[PDB]
Design a protein around this ligand. Sequence first.
Ligand code: HYQ
Length: 247
Amino acid sequence: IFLNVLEAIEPGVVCAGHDNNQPDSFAALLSSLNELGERQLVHVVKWAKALPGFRNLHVDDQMAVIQYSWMGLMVFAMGWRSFTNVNSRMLYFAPDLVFNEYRMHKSRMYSQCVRMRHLSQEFGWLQITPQEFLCMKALLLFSIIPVDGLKNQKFFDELRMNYIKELDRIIACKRKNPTSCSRRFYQLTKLLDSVQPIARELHQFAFDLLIKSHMVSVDFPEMMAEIISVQVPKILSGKVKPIYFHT
Ligand SMILES: O=C1[C@@H]2[C@H]3CC[C@H](CC3)[C@@H]2C(=O)N1c1ccc([N+](=O)[O-])c2ccccc12
């Protein structure tokens, strides 16, 4: 019933509202991205709260976990959309905001976009199924926490353990073949680990942009601006860190 729940709660299409009549400029692109980011955050919150066992977490931990993993979750899902929509050729942030190389450059996030596009390609190189994608995204929500722990660490550890086992099942079920399916699990865990460094570059870029937004003329929605100035700094200063499968 796990996979059914994931498929049932999976967010739908989310547009950015980008004016594709305009010629493209740093401000216009980033202003649309920030608006889309706020929109996606709202959907990620609803998605997370409807995940199996998620309400078992302390109230403060629930939001904490969502805010810390928000960027990684967006990276992962967007990498998936790009793979299934345009074969990783471009970055499908939204139906009305697709990034070609010109916008990657004009947005001033080229290196970050290069990393993300590489991630999207991995979905194809590894032949990731829709089901593995859903389970991995779920596990991604439980992959970053304060080094000093959450208000109720034990509950988080139990929930994380259960999602790892669900991923292990979706791999074991009629699909594999050999005796040691440590290979498919190994690469999927490696792929999830690869999201963290990308999220970190996006975190850094988001932080730097918010600090100088006043000049660059870029609006930051209320919720996104609070996460970037309250949550993000904690990740950048080393207080909250990703949980890596491999060292
Ligand atoms: O939120 C932000 C802005 C904040 C502030 C500056 C930029 C990165 C983070 C801007 C931005 O690009 N984004 C992003 C917006 C929307 C998506 N998405 O749903 O496709 C994103 C997916 C991956 C990475 C970032 C996404």
